[PDB]
Design an enzyme around this catalytic site. Structure first.
Site, mmCIF file in Angstrom:
data_model
loop_
_atom_site.group_PDB
_atom_site.id
_atom_site.type_symbol
_atom_site.label_atom_id
_atom_site.label_comp_id
_atom_site.label_asym_id
_atom_site.label_seq_id
_atom_site.Cartn_x
_atom_site.Cartn_y
_atom_site.Cartn_z
ATOM 1 N N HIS A 165 -3.946 6.117 3.648
ATOM 2 C CA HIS A 165 -4.644 4.928 3.159
ATOM 3 C C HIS A 165 -4.009 3.639 3.687
ATOM 4 O O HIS A 165 -4.710 2.809 4.296
ATOM 5 C CB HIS A 165 -4.690 5.002 1.614
ATOM 6 C CG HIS A 165 -5.426 3.868 0.969
ATOM 7 N ND1 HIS A 165 -4.814 2.679 0.659
ATOM 8 C CD2 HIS A 165 -6.696 3.772 0.531
ATOM 9 C CE1 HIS A 165 -5.700 1.883 0.078
ATOM 10 N NE2 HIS A 165 -6.849 2.521 -0.007
ATOM 11 N N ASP A 188 -1.743 2.195 18.127
ATOM 12 C CA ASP A 188 -2.518 0.965 17.899
ATOM 13 C C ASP A 188 -1.850 -0.033 16.960
ATOM 14 O O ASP A 188 -2.349 -1.133 16.792
ATOM 15 C CB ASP A 188 -3.923 1.339 17.440
ATOM 16 C CG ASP A 188 -4.665 2.205 18.441
ATOM 17 O OD1 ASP A 188 -4.274 2.240 19.649
ATOM 18 O OD2 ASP A 188 -5.656 2.841 18.051
ATOM 19 N N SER A 222 -11.202 -0.839 -0.918
ATOM 20 C CA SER A 222 -10.016 -0.730 -0.048
ATOM 21 C C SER A 222 -10.217 -1.099 1.424
ATOM 22 O O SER A 222 -9.332 -1.660 2.047
ATOM 23 C CB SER A 222 -9.406 0.674 -0.090
ATOM 24 O OG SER A 222 -8.640 0.872 -1.264
ATOM 25 N N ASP A 232 0.797 -1.189 0.000
ATOM 26 C CA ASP A 232 0.000 0.000 0.000
ATOM 27 C C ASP A 232 0.856 1.276 0.000
ATOM 28 O O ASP A 232 1.999 1.269 -0.483
ATOM 29 C CB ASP A 232 -0.971 -0.042 1.208
ATOM 30 C CG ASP A 232 -2.279 0.670 0.935
ATOM 31 O OD1 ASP A 232 -2.263 1.903 0.752
ATOM 32 O OD2 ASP A 232 -3.325 -0.026 0.908
ATOM 33 N N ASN A 266 -14.002 0.091 -7.334
ATOM 34 C CA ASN A 266 -15.119 0.994 -7.044
ATOM 35 C C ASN A 266 -15.777 1.530 -8.311
ATOM 36 O O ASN A 266 -16.093 2.714 -8.388
ATOM 37 C CB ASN A 266 -14.621 2.155 -6.183
ATOM 38 C CG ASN A 266 -13.878 1.695 -4.919
ATOM 39 O OD1 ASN A 266 -14.176 0.657 -4.325
ATOM 40 N ND2 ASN A 266 -12.948 2.522 -4.467
#
Ligand code: CA
Ligand code: CA
Ligand code: NA
Lengths: 64, 311
Positions: free
Chosen positions: B72, B44, B251, B35, B170
């Site tokens: 992203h 986290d 995604s 990515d 998409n």
């Protein structure tokens, strides 16, 4: 509500931009070379235009 | 910063438990997030990154760098495996005990080069074979057209026991708009659900790319078939500046599935990648999706086999 502009394939990037903005005036238009690999985020305010070396539209422009 | 909820809707949904406040699972599995990079020092994500590599620089591999300047990749990784942070107040992903291989293959505006992606896929496979690791690739990325260089890499990795999970695209709601590598026979194409009920089930988002109607219905994956569906609209996760953000797309669906895959694999380490894939398919069928344009009873070209869940 317009989410695709199939009639723009083969048109110039300048023409494409005019047509898209007529439907979607706040569109954030991003121009990338044909074959560029992209994230699959759906961004409702974006329209990506993929272009050939003559700056003609290489594939159906879509919202996202 | 704290998320709006420690368990975003997609996490509660895939767990099939609206009451959860934390997640568990995925120990011993690696998820390779190919990515925009990952902010591996997010509270986290801390300590999850076992590999951090960059395929986008003048040097074809920069080891020890995988910097996200976009968001992203950080967001995707959090959905897979965010672990609530050392003090337990952060966001949770599907498989918080899985480890992360953060491979940067897209640049800082969320676009990249075929060659870098292909190189990165092959490298995962080589690393997997060398280390004897169980690895799931997440690719929240693609192109409308099939790219054969990427396809060659996917087949190479699948041939070396690496599961590949990839966004459907998409380009919906029109039929046969599925993209690649999702649409490859050896990649699990993931469609995006929204948090709306229609026809008694979750609804496929209109934006989600549809498979080929001609080859949907057989519960056998051909090229251009959607495989499974997962939460993909308005998904909160980790962000590259250290807080959280809510974005949408196939995604965001993809990592729910990559994460679920890691969770399943960790719970039965005797499985191969293709047995794992088969069980994703079996689980999908438990939750047939009937909502959304082109969705219907059985295997369909909007939602594929259905919605695989924890239970
Ligand atoms: Ca099929
Ligand atoms: Ca169905
Ligand atoms: Na596929």
């Amino acid at each position: 509500l317009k989410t695709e502009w199939p009639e723009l394939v083969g048109k110039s990037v300048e023409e494409a931009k005019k047509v898209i903005l007529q439907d979607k005036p706040e569109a954030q238009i991003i121009v990338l070379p044909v074959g560029t690999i992209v994230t699959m985020e759906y961004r409702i305010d974006r329209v990506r235009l993929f272009v050939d070396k003559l700056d003609n539209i290489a594939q159906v422009p879509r919202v996202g | 910063a704290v998320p709006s909820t420690q368990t975003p809707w997609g996490i509660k949904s895939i767990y099939n438990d609206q009451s959860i406040t934390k997640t568990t699972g995925g120990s011993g599995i690696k998820v390779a997030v190919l990515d925009t990079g990952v902010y591996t020092s997010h509270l986290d994500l801390a300590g999850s990154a076992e590999q951090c590599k960059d395929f986008t620089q003048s040097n074809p591999l920069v080891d020890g760098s995988c910097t996200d300047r976009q968001g992203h990749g950080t967001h995707v990784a959090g959905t897979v495996l965010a672990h609530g942070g050392s003090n337990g107040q952060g966001v949770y992903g599907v498989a918080p005990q899985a480890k992360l291989w953060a491979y940067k293959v897209l640049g800082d505006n969320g676009s990249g080069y075929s060659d870098d992606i292909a190189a990165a896929i092959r490298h995962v496979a080589d690393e997997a074979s060398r280390t004897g690791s169980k690895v799931v690739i997440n690719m929240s990325l693609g192109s409308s057209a099939k790219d054969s260089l990427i396809a060659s890499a996917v087949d190479y990795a699948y041939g070396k026991g690496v599961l590949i999970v990839a966004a459907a695209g998409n380009s919906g709601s029109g039929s046969n708009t599925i993209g690649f590598p999702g649409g490859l026979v050896n990649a699990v194409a993931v469609a995006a659900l929204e948090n709306v009920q229609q026809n008694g089930t979750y609804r496929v988002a209109d934006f989600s790319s549809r498979g080929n109607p001609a080859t949907a219905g057989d519960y056998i994956i051909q090229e251009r078939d959607i495989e499974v569906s997962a939460p993909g609209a308005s998904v909160e996760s980790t962000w590259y500046t250290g807080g959280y953000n809510t974005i949408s797309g196939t995604s965001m669906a993809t990592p729910h599935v990559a994460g679920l895959a890691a969770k399943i694999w960790s719970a039965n380490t005797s499985l191969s990648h293709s047995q794992l894939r088969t069980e994703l398919q079996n689980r999908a069928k438990v939750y047939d999706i009937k909502g959304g344009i082109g969705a219907g009873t059985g295997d369909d070209y909007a939602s594929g086999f259905g919605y695989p869940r924890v239970k």
